Design a protein around this ligand. Structure first.
Ligand SMILES: *[C@@H]1O[C@H](CO)[C@@H](O[C@@H]2O[C@H](CO)[C@@H](O[C@@H]3O[C@H](CO)[C@@H](O)[C@H](O[C@H]4O[C@H](CO)[C@@H](O)[C@H](O)[C@@H]4O)[C@@H]3O)[C@H](O)[C@H]2NC(C)=O)[C@H](O)[C@H]1NC(C)=O
Ligand SMILES: *[C@@H]1O[C@H](CO)[C@@H](O[C@@H]2O[C@H](CO)[C@@H](O)[C@H](O)[C@H]2NC(C)=O)[C@H](O)[C@H]1NC(C)=O
Ligand SMILES: *[C@@H]1O[C@H](CO)[C@@H](O[C@@H]2O[C@H](CO)[C@@H](O)[C@H](O)[C@H]2NC(C)=O)[C@H](O)[C@H]1NC(C)=O
Ligand SMILES: *[C@@H]1O[C@H](CO)[C@@H](O)[C@H](O)[C@H]1NC(C)=O
Ligand SMILES: *[C@@H]1O[C@H](CO)[C@@H](O)[C@H](O)[C@H]1NC(C)=O
Ligand SMILES: *[C@@H]1O[C@H](CO)[C@@H](O)[C@H](O)[C@H]1NC(C)=O
Ligand SMILES: *[C@@H]1O[C@H](CO)[C@@H](O)[C@H](O)[C@H]1NC(C)=O
Ligand SMILES: *[C@@H]1O[C@H](CO)[C@@H](O)[C@H](O)[C@H]1NC(C)=O
Ligand SMILES: *[C@@H]1O[C@H](CO)[C@@H](O)[C@H](O)[C@H]1NC(C)=O
Ligand SMILES: *[C@@H]1O[C@H](CO)[C@@H](O)[C@H](O)[C@H]1NC(C)=O
Ligand SMILES: *[C@@H]1O[C@H](CO)[C@@H](O)[C@H](O)[C@H]1NC(C)=O
Ligand SMILES: *[C@@H]1O[C@H](CO)[C@@H](O)[C@H](O)[C@H]1NC(C)=O
Ligand SMILES: *[C@@H]1O[C@H](CO)[C@@H](O)[C@H](O)[C@H]1NC(C)=O
Ligand SMILES: *[C@@H]1O[C@H](CO)[C@@H](O)[C@H](O)[C@H]1NC(C)=O
Ligand SMILES: *[C@@H]1O[C@H](CO)[C@@H](O)[C@H](O)[C@H]1NC(C)=O
Ligand SMILES: *[C@@H]1O[C@H](CO)[C@@H](O)[C@H](O)[C@H]1NC(C)=O
Ligand SMILES: *[C@@H]1O[C@H](CO)[C@@H](O)[C@H](O)[C@H]1NC(C)=O
Ligand SMILES: *[C@@H]1O[C@H](CO)[C@@H](O)[C@H](O)[C@H]1NC(C)=O
Ligand SMILES: *[C@@H]1O[C@H](CO)[C@@H](O)[C@H](O)[C@H]1NC(C)=O
Ligand SMILES: *[C@@H]1O[C@H](CO)[C@@H](O)[C@H](O)[C@H]1NC(C)=O
Lengths: 104, 122, 441, 125, 125, 125, 48, 122, 104
């Protein structure tokens, strides 16, 4: 039961600005992390998989980096529709636990 | 065009079995390519995995709820159902049903398509 | 060092393209349902994922088998019916004169002739109203079929209305279906499913207009084996149907006269009311918007500034030069010139086309077999959809910006290719060999 | 109810697709139009019986996953286990060794014959 | 002939009737009028081949009495051994356990597949 | 290329001819004219399936050289091994014991049934 | 030498009024008669 | 209607083979539901067993006459035969052939129907 | 990795008062719980094991109750030496995780 912590728990930014969100796991999950996105109202939508591999159908601004027990999601330029709650995932061992959720 | 729809009682007396049926229009449950998960999210909290079911019936639930839950998938009508017994106040949440392309070793657990999301207050 | 060994796998998911014999899954009529398997009430579809399959519309063996099966069904249904060999006598004909309209002039003729009866040593003088296309002058006329071959009068009880016939594969074979929208019939389809049986394919016969066809879910779609070459036909599949209603306002009557023991010939009696040409109406605004969509989709391939000319059929026999269809027990040969007469460059009125009704029907482009259709009592109305087109490019000096597409047809395979464009037949090969660290014993 | 997921694992990797072999094995068996249906049924039966005879000649009778004792020659395919069972699908694998199949079948046949002869010789003692 | 003593043990108890399985087993195989006998023969062949394929999928290929390793759920029948083999007949037993037959078939199939995978990974070492 | 020496060892001795059983074993399977062709195919299929059922009833399923535990009564034949495998051919042997075939098949059938029953009794413990 | 295998202690529910074999025999007899009448002269000229 | 009829030499010269053929009209021998016994009764004595034969050839004779007797059964002709070799002067008896529902273990050995009864003397 | 939560996280009480501290586990640890009494400065010292099962060497004032996912430790009468940190333990599955620690 790996525990995930997202830093910061909640941040506010301005359009067209860089932003970075860090994810820390209690254990070493290698490169088994997927970054999701849940706009309010509707269900979560996957953004990134396997830390760095970007899923087809998202703007290229999103990026992911890190390894071991530390990972990070970076948005190079903030956009009006990029105001959703990002989350983490443990995609390497049962059970799969998500993050607390950082609201933009 | 692939999506999922959830149905069931949106309000229940909080001591009985809670039934929630997710039906998928698009891909087929019979095909051994996708696992069908039942992610949950309480208000003011993050997501929480509950369990998953395969076409062959090899299901696996969350260790926290390994006793109070049962997932049954029927491929004749291509749907699945979550039965959560002994529901309490902690079950007031949105119950999403997700699709995992773990069937096939191309990628790990990679929830990509999510259901509409039904808020089952209790 | 490798220490790898062969391992045999049975039930492997691998397939290869192959041709086999499909059979019915239909759920008295010419398209015999009794000689056709019944389907299940819950068809199963298995949507394959992360697989792309090379489909080819113009090399499908399903359409050829369907054409052969339709011809065989037609012959089998026509076999147990009266053969009209005694009716090849000379006819004394005169023009109709009662309640005749200008359009219906030089048309159906009151003919009288002697014919055999139940008793061999006796004859009877009978009369009938025969359409001009059926009879030909030798004040005496003979039926067009007389010097070619005798007719088998279609039995009145059997209905010619299309009935869906669900095609299925035998054991060890699979029917792949391309669900990928905007699929042009050729190339790698990425969205693939497996279907136990095909959908309901109505065996409708028509030329220049695919009636009651399958509608595209995205937009008007243009398909051709080689669009650069003008010899090959072009199939246009609409995304919405154009409602078209044909009718034969004449109130005909059917009289049975005994030409022999048991065998009875059905003839036209009295045209109750006025003799008016059969006509077919198609909405002008719907046709205009549909044609706009077609020219846009054709400009997508032929350039964004070329002129698109649509002209009537070039020429040839009546069946291929006009929109010939069958409904309500009657065969219409409506002349489509007002529809495909326009040029495109960068309220409630509807177009009315005239329709000529034949009886001696030489369908399937076959010589030596004719299909005299008995007349249908009462007025016939027929409302249907138009969801397809078969266009041919007039090649030659079209190297300039001019582009002239005209109605085509003749071959009935194009009618079947517009509904079987997504179904392909494959054969499974369960056996397989792989490397693994196994070792027997 | 028997169809219920035919193929399905076509896009899956070889290792994962090998876990659902049963679903693809149950469906391999089940005037002139009666002849059409009859000929289709007889062709299916003949194909299934030929496949079963070929399996039995190798000693893999009544087994879906049966692995023999013949070695894997490197000339047939230099791809390693890590790149064949987790990175390639069954269709690609079949297309890759489509022209190296008959010799493998002959080797399996002669190996099974030799194994049976050796069993007879050992048991005779 | 092959028809000698066909059925016969229909009225016998399950235990007694289980001793004469060969007699029933060997009797399962053997212009418009030609299509009648020919179609009947093809139908019998298809049925026998399907039943044999089911047996092979369950791993009991080439065996008349082959008892598997899947547990018997008490929900299907609470009767004890003494009250079924020595007190009930095969027809009554079949009429009793008819609703749970498909579930048992699926359980046998999945158990045989799991056993094959277990043997594969055991032999890999 | 499946024919490849059909009945090649017809004149060979039984011992020599027993080493090429697979060659002869693989060739047993492969308007009115279509009826006759399909009837021939169905007859071949029926013969092959009856053959396979007969082999399976003796417990020799999936084996080309399967040797059982039934004793060889000297009444059927008095020739020793030296004068059989090295001095006689298969056709002569078949003609010699042509009238002691059914009883051998029956003995094999009951021996296999008894073996299955004994295996079940032993495995019950 | 037809073989009859007597079964003991078996009670079977028979229903002569729902036997498909009788309808099968009726169709067989009709088809046999129709086939037997095929290779014979047709008396069309007799209608005088 | 089920019955059994015995045939063969009703009087033989002692000290050679004695053959008795019992044929059954009714229940079939090939059926595994029955055993066919060869009960005997000498004058002034009680019933005495000899042996029984099953459809599959698993016969069992009396321990007293385990050497002098041979019981065979042909199912094609649907009849069985008893061969008593080297019969002595004490072999003058009524040779019944009886049915037994031993197969189909509903009941134990129970001779319900008997033959007419031949009167072989020697 | 079962997570244990102690409520209240920190309390202040007067001498000679009944106090109660509850312990909640994410999963069902059945009857496997031990309480520890780490005094400030000194090492942890065992007080209660196996739900209640009061181990020899302590006063009978302490008591334990509960089951399933909820347990509770009750001190009948607060004493001057009962001002140490109470801790939980998941002695039912590897790894064994203790509570946050409630300070009196
Ligand atoms: C495209 O599809 C449409 C819709 O299916 C189709 O229109 C249908 O045409 C058929 C004729 O081909 C119509 O069938 C008739 O229906 C009327 C009732 O409306 C009946 O009274 C008619 O009965 C006649 O036929 C019987 C059987 O032969 C006789 O026993 C009887 O005495 C009558 O002579 C006949 O069944 C059908 O009603 C319409 N349906 C609609 C909704 O309009 C159209 O024909 C198709 N396109 C083409 C080119 O065929
Ligand atoms: C769909 O299939 C393709 C290949 O058929 C997969 O592509 C592979 O992806 C994995 C993981 O990203 C790589 O390690 C492989 O090298 C890729 N192979 C090829 C040939 O591209 C793809 O991952 C599959 N997608 C899904 C969702 O299953
Ligand atoms: C015919 O079958 C019936 C049952 O169908 C047999 O009756 C059984 O007799 C035994 C005697 O030991 C009882 O223990 C059983 O309870 C009886 N069955 C029932 C259902 O009550 C009868 O014995 C059979 N006949 C023969 C000759 O064996
Ligand atoms: C019938 O009308 C046509 C058209 O006017 C004419 O050519 C033809 O001669 C007429 N028939 C007779 C018999 O006059
Ligand atoms: C019909 O027969 C009569 C009798 O001779 C004859 O006058 C008449 O011309 C015939 N009808 C024709 C030839 O159309
Ligand atoms: C039959 O008659 C028509 C009209 O006179 C003619 O055009 C046709 O050629 C004739 N048939 C043949 C086979 O010539
Ligand atoms: C059809 O589509 C395939 C791929 O989508 C393409 O390669 C091919 O050129 C297309 N053909 C036509 C006639 O549009
Ligand atoms: C014709 O198209 C309309 C469009 O909605 C449809 O409702 C109707 O069923 C179609 N009729 C056919 C296919 O006969
Ligand atoms: C289509 O026809 C043209 C005619 O010039 C030819 O050059 C071209 O090769 C054809 N297309 C294909 C795919 O062969
Ligand atoms: C046709 O001709 C016949 C005589 O042959 C006559 O009785 C009839 O009135 C005419 N008109 C029609 C419509 O039949
Ligand atoms: C077709 O349109 C014409 C012209 O408006 C009209 O007179 C006729 O009644 C219409 N018929 C049908 C069947 O719509
Ligand atoms: C006939 O078709 C026209 C369009 O051509 C349409 O406006 C009208 O409603 C139709 N009438 C019917 C189906 O009765
Ligand atoms: C279709 O409608 C447009 C709209 O003005 C018109 O310009 C065009 O001429 C119409 N098409 C015809 C009449 O064929
Ligand atoms: C087509 O239209 C032209 C005039 O546009 C006309 O001369 C011709 O007769 C019509 N029919 C055919 C078959 O060309
Ligand atoms: C159709 O009608 C037009 C206009 O009257 C006419 O020119 C043409 O010859 C007719 N036939 C064909 C085949 O277009
Ligand atoms: C096309 O339609 C117009 C408008 O009715 C008409 O004037 C013209 O003669 C038709 N034919 C051609 C070839 O334009
Ligand atoms: C046609 O005429 C007959 C003559 O009685 C009449 O009964 C029938 O109603 C007419 N047809 C229609 C559509 O009215
Ligand atoms: C395959 O894996 C083996 C394992 O040691 C390795 O030595 C070899 O280099 C690999 N080859 C490729 C092409 O990856
Ligand atoms: C056999 O197939 C492989 C697969 O790529 C190919 O490389 C090789 O050249 C082929 N050999 C022959 C003789 O066809
Ligand atoms: C079998 O039935 C019940 C228990 O299931 C019991 O009454 C009976 O005694 C059992 N049989 C034996 C032999 O114990």
């Amino acid at each position: 039961d790996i525990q995930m912590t997202q830093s910061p728990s909640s941040l506010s930014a301005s359009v067209g600005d860089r932003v970075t969100i860090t994810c820390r796991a209690s254990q070493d999950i290698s490169s088994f992390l997927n970054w999701y996105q849940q706009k309010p109202g509707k269900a979560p939508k996957l953004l990134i998989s396997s830390v760095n591999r970007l899923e087809s159908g998202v703007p290229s601004r999103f990026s992911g980096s890190g390894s071991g027990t530390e990972f990070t999601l970076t948005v190079s330029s903030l956009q009006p529709e990029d105001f959703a709650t990002y989350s983490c995932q443990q995609c390497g061992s049962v059970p799969y636990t998500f993050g607390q959720g950082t609201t933009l | 065009q692939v999506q999922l729809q959830e149905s069931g009682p949106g309000l229940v007396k909080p001591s009985e079995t809670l039934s929630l049926t997710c039906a998928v229009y698009g891909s087929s449950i019979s095909g051994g390519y996708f696992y069908w998960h039942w992610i949950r999210q309480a208000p003011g909290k993050g997501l929480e995995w509950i369990g998953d079911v395969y076409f062959s019936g090899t299901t696996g639930y969350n260790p926290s709820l390994k006793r109070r839950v049962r997932i049954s998938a029927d491929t004749s009508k291509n749907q699945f159902s979550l039965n959560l017994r002994s529901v309490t106040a902690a079950d007031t949440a949105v119950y999403f049903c997700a699709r995992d392309p773990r069937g096939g070793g191309w990628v790990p657990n990679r929830f990509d398509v999510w259901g509409a999301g039904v808020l089952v207050t209790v | 060092a490798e220490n790898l060994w062969v391992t045999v796998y049975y039930g492997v998911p691998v397939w290869k393209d192959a041709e086999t014999t499909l059979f019915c899954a239909s759920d008295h009529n010419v398209w015999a349902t009794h000689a056709c398997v019944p389907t299940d009430p819950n068809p199963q579809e298995i949507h394959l994922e992360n697989v792309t399959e090379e489909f080819n519309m113009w090399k499908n063996n399903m359409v050829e088998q369907m054409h052969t099966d339709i011809i065989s069904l037609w012959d089998q249904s026509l076999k147990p019916c009266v053969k009209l060999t005694p009716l090849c006598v000379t006819l004394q004909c005169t023009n109709v004169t009662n309640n005749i309209t200008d359009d219906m002039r030089g048309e159906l003729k009151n003919c009288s002739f002697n014919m055999t009866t139940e008793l061999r040593d006796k004859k009877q003088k009978v009369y009938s109203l025969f359409y001009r296309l059926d009879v030909v002058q030798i004040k005496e006329y003979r039926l067009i079929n007389c010097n070619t071959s005798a007719c088998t009068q279609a039995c009145p009880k059997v209905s010619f209305e299309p009935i869906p016939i669900h095609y299925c594969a035998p054991a060890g074979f699979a029917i792949l279906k391309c669900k990928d929208k905007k699929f042009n019939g050729t190339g790698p389809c990425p969205s693939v499913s497996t279907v136990q049986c095909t959908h309901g394919i109505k065996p409708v016969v028509s030329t220049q207009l695919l009636l009651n066809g399958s509608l595209a879910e995205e937009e008007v779609m243009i398909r051709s084996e080689n669009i650069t070459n003008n010899a090959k036909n072009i199939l246009v599949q609409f995304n919405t149907p154009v409602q078209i209603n044909c009718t034969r306002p004449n109130n005909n009557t059917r009289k049975s006269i005994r030409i022999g023991p048991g065998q009875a010939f059905y003839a036209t009696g009295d045209i109750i009311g006025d003799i008016r040409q059969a006509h077919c109406n198609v909405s002008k605004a719907t046709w205009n918007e549909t044609l706009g969509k077609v020219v846009k989709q054709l400009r997508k391939h032929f350039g964004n500034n070329t002129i698109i000319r649509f002209a009537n059929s070039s020429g040839g026999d009546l069946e291929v030069t006009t929109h010939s269809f069958n409904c309500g027990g009657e065969f219409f040969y409506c002349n489509t010139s007002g529809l495909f007469n326009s040029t495109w460059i960068s309220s409630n009125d509807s177009i009315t086309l005239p329709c000529r009704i034949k009886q001696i029907i030489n369908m399937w482009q076959r010589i030596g077999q004719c299909m005299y259709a008995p007349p249908i009592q009462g007025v016939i109305r027929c409302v249907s959809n138009i969801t397809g087109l078969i266009l041919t490019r007039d090649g030659g000096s079209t190297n300039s910006t001019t582009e002239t597409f005209r109605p085509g047809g003749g071959d009935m395979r194009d009618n079947w290719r517009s509904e079987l464009y997504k179904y392909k037949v494959v054969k499974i090969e369960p056996l397989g060999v792989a490397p693994t660290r196994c070792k027997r014993r | 109810a028997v169809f219920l997921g035919f193929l399905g694992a076509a896009g899956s990797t070889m290792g994962a697709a090998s876990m659902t072999l049963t679903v693809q094995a149950r469906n391999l068996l089940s005037t002139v139009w009666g002849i059409k249906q009859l000929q289709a049924r007889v062709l299916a039966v003949e194909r299934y019986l030929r496949d079963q005879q070929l399996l039995g000649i190798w000693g893999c009778s009544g087994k879906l996953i049966c692995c023999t004792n013949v070695p894997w020659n490197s000339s047939w395919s230099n791809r390693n286990l890590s790149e064949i069972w987790d990175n390639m699908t069954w269709l690609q694998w079949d297309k890759e060794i489509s022209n190296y199949t008959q010799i493998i079948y002959g080797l399996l046949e002669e190996s099974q014959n030799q194994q049976e002869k050796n069993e007879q010789d050992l048991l005779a003692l």
